[PDB]
Amino acid sequence: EDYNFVFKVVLIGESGVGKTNLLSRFTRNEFSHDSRTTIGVEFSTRTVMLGTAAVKAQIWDTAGLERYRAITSAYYRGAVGALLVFDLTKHQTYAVVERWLKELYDHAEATIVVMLVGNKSDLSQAREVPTEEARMFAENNGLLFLETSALDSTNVELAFETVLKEIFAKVSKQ
Numbered sequence: 661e662d663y664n665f666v667f668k669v670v671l672i673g674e675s676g677v678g679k680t681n682l683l684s685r686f687t688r689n690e691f692s693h694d695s696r697t698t699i700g701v702e703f704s705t706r707t708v709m710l711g712t713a714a715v716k717a718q719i720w721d722t723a724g725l726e727r728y729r730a731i732t733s734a735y736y737r738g739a740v741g742a743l744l745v746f747d748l749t750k751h752q753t754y755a756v757v758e759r760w761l762k763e764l765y766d767h768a769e770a771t772i773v774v775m776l777v778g779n780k781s782d783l784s785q786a787r788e789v790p791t792e793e794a795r796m797f798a799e800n801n802g803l804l805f806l807e808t809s810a811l812d813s814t815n816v817e818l819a820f821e822t823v824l825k826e827i828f829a830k831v832s833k834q
């Protein structure tokens with residue numbers, strides 16, 4: 661229980677993109693295919709060293725994020741980070757990224773650090789979203805960017821640590 665900050669980081673994007681498995685990989689180094697999940701919303705935690713600061717990352721996840729729900733407001737409330745995940749082998753999951761941003765900014769504060777994540781990079785042979793295209797989008801929209809694989813661990817820790825360093829930088833100036 662050595663930590664100085666608690667950072668709430670929510671995972672968002674279409675179902676099937678890998679959000680639950682980015683959580684499990686980062687927090688438990690685990691990867692399932694059909695994940696046992698509780699009803700509604702959950703989080704898992706991981707303490708991370710940022711230089712000499714101890715930060716407790718609170719990673720939030722759910723299966724039904726969906727604007728009609730009463731719970732959406734509470735889900736986003738107090739979030740200082742977000743990973744907006746798409747499946748790089750499914751163009752459709754990336755085509756709705758703008759819509760997810762809008763949903764996110766209706767409920768999160770503008771200071772939230774957002775990373776656009778292209779997941780399933782181990783399947784880059786079957787890619788439908790050029791890295792360059794996704795990268796420019798993120799730059800035009802004030803989003804950090806990375807491609808990850810929750811399956812092969814590529815960039816998962818880096819994804820989370822980059823968001824967390826950006827949050828810490830930011831909140832130090834608040």
Ligand SMILES: Nc1nc2c(ncn2[C@@H]2O[C@H](COP(=O)(O)OP(=O)(O)O)[C@@H](O)[C@H]2O)c(=O)[nH]1
Binds near residue numbers: 695808
């Ligand atoms: N090849 C590959 N499959 C993945 C990856 N991440 C998740 N999956 C699979 O995609 C499916 C959905 O992933 P899940 O974590 O439940 O996504 P969620 O619906 O966004 O929470 C499951 O079969 C996962 O095992 C990845 O990085 N690579």
Ligand SMILES: [Mg+2]
Binds near residue numbers: 679680722723
């Ligand atoms: Mg899930």
